[PDB]
Design a protein around this ligand. Structure first.
Ligand SMILES: *[C@@H]1O[C@H](CO)[C@@H](O[C@@H]2O[C@H](CO)[C@@H](O)[C@H](O)[C@H]2NC(C)=O)[C@H](O)[C@H]1NC(C)=O
Ligand SMILES: *[C@@H]1O[C@H](CO)[C@@H](O[C@@H]2O[C@H](CO)[C@@H](O)[C@H](O)[C@H]2NC(C)=O)[C@H](O)[C@H]1NC(C)=O
Ligand SMILES: *[C@@H]1O[C@H](CO)[C@@H](O)[C@H](O)[C@H]1NC(C)=O
Lengths: 97, 49
C-alpha cells in the first residue's frame, strides 16, 4: 500500500542476446519467438538485478528468449485499435522513416 | 598423511572468461567481482580437471 519499494531499485541488465529489451517495440522483424522464464536449451537471457540506493548488487532472476530469422512477425510501439491495415506517413519536415 | 596424491594431477583449465586466473594478481582493474561456486545467471567459468 505505502510504497516501501521507494528505496529498492529493481531493473534489467543487458545479457548475451544480440538485441536489446527496450528496443523490441521498434520495428524489428523475426520469424517466431516464444518467451519463457524457465531454462530451455539454446536460449540467451536478460538478468535481473536488485539493489538498495545503489550500494551493493545482487542477481535475482532472468528472462529466457529464443528466436529464428524471418520477415513475418513485427514489433509495434503501441496497439492502435480500429485500423484495418497499419501504416503511417508524416510530410514536410524531418522524420525517421 | 602420506601423499597418495603424488600420482593424481588436479588443475584448472581456461574457460570462457576474457582474462586468466593466474594473471588476476597482476595490476588488473575492475569495479566489483563476487566470486562463487554455485550457478548464477550471467557468469563465465573456469573448469576443474
Ligand atoms: C510502516 O508502518 C505503517 C504503519 O505501522 C505501515 O502502514 C500500513 O501497514 C500495514 C501492514 O504492514 C499495511 O497493510 C497497510 O497497507 C499500510 N498502510 C498503507 C497506507 O499502505 C507501513 O506499510 C510500514 N512500512 C513498511 C512495512 O515498509
Ligand atoms: C598405504 O598403507 C600405509 C600403511 O598401511 C598407509 O599409511 C598410513 O595409513 C593410515 C590409514 O590409511 C593413515 O591414517 C596414516 O596417516 C598413513 N601414514 C602416513 C605416514 O601417512 C598409507 O596411507 C597407504 N597409502 C594410501 C592409502 O594411499
Ligand atoms: C513539423 O512536425 C511537427 C510534428 O511534431 C508538426 O507539429 C509541425 O507542424 C511540422 N511543421 C513545422 C513547420 O514545424
Amino acid at each position: 500500500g505505502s510504497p516501501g519499494d521507494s528505496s529498492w531499485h529493481i531493473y534489467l541488465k543487458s545479457g548475451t542476446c544480440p538485441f536489446s529489451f527496450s528496443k523490441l517495440n521498434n520495428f524489428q522483424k523475426f520469424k517466431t519467438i516464444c518467451f519463457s522464464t524457465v531454462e530451455v536449451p539454446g536460449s540467451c537471457n536478460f538478468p535481473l538485478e536488485a539493489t538498495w540506493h545503489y550500494t551493493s548488487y545482487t542477481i535475482v532472476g532472468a528472462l529466457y528468449v529464443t528466436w529464428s530469422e524471418g520477415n513475418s512477425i513485427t514489433g509495434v510501439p503501441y496497439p492502435v485499435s480500429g485500423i484495418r491495415e497499419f501504416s503511417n506517413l508524416v510530410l514536410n519536415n524531418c522524420t525517421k522513416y
